[PDB]
Design a protein around this nucleic acid. Sequence first.
RNA 1: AAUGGGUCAGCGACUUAUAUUCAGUGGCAAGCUUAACCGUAUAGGGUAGGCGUAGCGAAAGCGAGUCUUAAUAGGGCGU
RNA 2: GGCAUGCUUGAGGUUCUAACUCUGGUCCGUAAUCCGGAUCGAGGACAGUGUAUGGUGGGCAGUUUGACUGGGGCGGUCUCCUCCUAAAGAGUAACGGAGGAGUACGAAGGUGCGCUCAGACCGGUCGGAAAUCGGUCGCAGAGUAUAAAGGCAAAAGCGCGCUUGACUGCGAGACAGACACGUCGAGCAGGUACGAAAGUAGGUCUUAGUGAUCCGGUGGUUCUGUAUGGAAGGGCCAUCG
Lengths: 76, 63, 71, 50
Amino acid sequence: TRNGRDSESKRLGVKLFGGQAVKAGNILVRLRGTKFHAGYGVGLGKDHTLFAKVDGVVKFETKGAFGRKYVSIVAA
Amino acid sequence: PKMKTKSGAAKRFKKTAGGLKHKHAFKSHILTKMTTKRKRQLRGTSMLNKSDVARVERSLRLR
Amino acid sequence: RAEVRTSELAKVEGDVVSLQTLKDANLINQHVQRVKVMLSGEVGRAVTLKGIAATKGARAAIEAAGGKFED
Amino acid sequence: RELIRLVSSAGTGHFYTTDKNKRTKPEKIEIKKYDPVVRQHVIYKEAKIK
RNA sequence: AAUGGGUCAGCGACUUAUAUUCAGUGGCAAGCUUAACCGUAUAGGGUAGGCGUAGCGAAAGCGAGUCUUAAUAGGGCGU
RNA sequence: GGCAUGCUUGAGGUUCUAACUCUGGUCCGUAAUCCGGAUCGAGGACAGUGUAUGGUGGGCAGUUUGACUGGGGCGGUCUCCUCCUAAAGAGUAACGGAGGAGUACGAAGGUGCGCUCAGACCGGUCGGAAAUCGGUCGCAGAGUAUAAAGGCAAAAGCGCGCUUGACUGCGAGACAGACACGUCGAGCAGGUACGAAAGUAGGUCUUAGUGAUCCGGUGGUUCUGUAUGGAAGGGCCAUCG
Ligand SMILES: [Mg+2]
Ligand SMILES: [Mg+2]
Ligand SMILES: [Mg+2]
Ligand SMILES: [Mg+2]
Ligand SMILES: [Mg+2]
Ligand SMILES: [Mg+2]
Ligand SMILES: [Mg+2]
Ligand SMILES: [Mg+2]
Ligand SMILES: [Mg+2]
Ligand SMILES: [Mg+2]
Ligand SMILES: [Mg+2]
């Protein structure tokens, strides 16, 4: 009947773009259910949050069947 | 001395030679909700933040 | 409680570091009973600590550098 | 979902704390969990926190 | 076409005391300094007391390390 | 079982006078009938008065009664979740348009092993537009404990067997962010559950399901414990209103 009541905007998005250099446990993408899949050396935590495990450069490559988006980190 | 400190901030803030210690909060009287990852990350004794130093060091009479 | 640095043991007279001897000099307050000695430099001379209890490192300095630790 | 205690088997006063719907399941539970005093797993049983 | 003022001449508004922090300029310097009170009294005595020269810990305690911990494992604080 | 009467004492009843009472009589101080004192009369352990406690008490007093608001009064709204406004990074208002939460679950968790939807259509006894069965066509239009959004074939969906990792001590590094709070987590050490073994497991497809401090309550703990030895009371840990 009356309607205000929004929420407080959880600050999602994609950090660490296509040519960065990452540390051991950085946050790559704050996902909301797998826009991006776990590529070569990344983690996929509890609420589908991609994080690194090794060092290098982010790739953002599209692979395979289903055309899914794979975030791999390359030792380069 | 004509400079009385506040009694509450002398019990909430012990002073060491690396800042001001203080116990963390929210850990009392409803605890079966919370997660063990959250409980043991509130058990320690932290040190005070730089935005809060010059506020407390006027309540404690250190100015 | 109080405590005396090892470097301040040369600041007394008579080479008998009693409890009242440290109150004779101004190195310690009045109404102080239990005193330690910790390692904070070289001792300076040859003394005899008594009535006071040093740490592990201070006792390894005084007994090595020509002193004596009795009671 | 009333809340319950789970006092250890051995003599320690270590316990766990959880909740249990008393309405549907009336009887207790005998869950085997870790004990930080004997440093091994024992079994627990209790209710009635007060 | 909002406020105030008829003009002149007199008076009329960030001070003091006690504590403490930061800068400027000075004294002695791992040490610096006395308060009351004495004094032929702005000298001189008076070092009680304070701040330093070492921390960590709720505490006992131990100390260039110490606390948590089954750990001498990591980590916090410190030189 | 109870009597015999004492030792006592509580509670109830009657009577007596000597305490207290008399805004009763007439003598005295006194030339006054206030106040005393003497003496008859009445009441009498009551009334009355201190102190401790119940009840009644605007008789009286000190005070409280929120904000946003296309004037404020009335009404509506005060916290958290998802979408749109929101301009292809984050963020971003209106008494702008639409909806939900103040919980469930000891398996609806872990693991190993298996397996696919809805719908259409043809045939088939009492059902018939529809129940169960068989068949082809399917190409997720089903399903997800709970709103919508974003997802799901190593299916995050469905079934079976064993189980308690809905573990304790941690945590490099980051994301966010006035602060207090928040979110993800490799790895290490303890002791575990499945699997032949690599390996997986620090709850549930994700995001709502909640409230500081102060006080009190309960379990562990020489850490202190006001001369000493103990205790009370603190302190720390775990956990309740
Ligand atoms: Mg507690
Ligand atoms: Mg002195
Ligand atoms: Mg005028
Ligand atoms: Mg009358
Ligand atoms: Mg009134
Ligand atoms: Mg108003
Ligand atoms: Mg945007
Ligand atoms: Mg833009
Ligand atoms: Mg499920
Ligand atoms: Mg499978
Ligand atoms: Mg005692």
